Design a protein around this ligand. Sequence first.
Ligand SMILES: [Ca+2]
Ligand SMILES: [Ca+2]
Ligand SMILES: [Ca+2]
Ligand SMILES: [Ca+2]
Ligand SMILES: [Ca+2]
Ligand SMILES: [Ca+2]
Ligand SMILES: [Ca+2]
Lengths: 50, 50, 50, 113
Amino acid sequence: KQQNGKLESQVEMQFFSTTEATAGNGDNLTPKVVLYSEDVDIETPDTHIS
Amino acid sequence: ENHGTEDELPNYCFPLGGVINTETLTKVKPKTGQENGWEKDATEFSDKNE
Amino acid sequence: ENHGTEDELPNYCFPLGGVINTETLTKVKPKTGQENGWEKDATEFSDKNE
Amino acid sequence: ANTFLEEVRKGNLERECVEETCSYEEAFEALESSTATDVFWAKYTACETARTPRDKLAACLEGNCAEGLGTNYRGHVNITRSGIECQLWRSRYPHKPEINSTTHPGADLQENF
Ligand SMILES: [Ca+2]
Ligand SMILES: [Ca+2]
Ligand SMILES: [Ca+2]
Ligand SMILES: [Ca+2]
Ligand SMILES: [Ca+2]
Ligand SMILES: [Ca+2]
Ligand SMILES: [Ca+2]
């Protein structure tokens, strides 16, 4: 909740590009891959840890 | 009494660790005040992720 | 009761495409005239054949 | 550079680079050090003429001999064709070398050689 609507999602975008690509300078470092970081109420209902 | 067999679906055996073939990568963040462009951010992230 | 198992055969699996460790090669044609001759033909067969 | 079971095996220099044909990332696991890959690419720029056999490539990398035009040279030879003593490339005397890491960093200009 933030003071209005109060049911908003905390989802973040993260970026990556090739190592040796980046390697040196930012000679046009277009990122290669995109990830979406979130969090959810995980739970195991019917299994344990062996 | 040979009726044949029911094999409409495939059965796939997977690797043990989920994935195996993988590359490395490097963190990237947007370069502020340029409408584009990117820069390295190893301040709080490993420079080599899977 | 225990008669063992009827497993007088193997059940090898295979890779998804049937072949993964492929190797590149190139066209070879017999050289005219002189016997045992050989040379390269790149007119029609592509340079790389797996 | 192939055989994805060999991707379970971390790349080596003498393995994938010389004998095979290692990629920059293969060369990278194959050397770790950034300067190692710098010298590696300088050589491979000068050592396409000596890619095979492995002896040719290794002798072109080491530089203690002459390969191609010999800019890959890294040995102790400090004696010219006519035998005049070699000038140290750091000392601007007698002849000032404008050629250093600023112009052609790949040749890795040494002490006096
Ligand atoms: Ca990688
Ligand atoms: Ca390899
Ligand atoms: Ca390989
Ligand atoms: Ca690889
Ligand atoms: Ca490798
Ligand atoms: Ca190998
Ligand atoms: Ca060996």
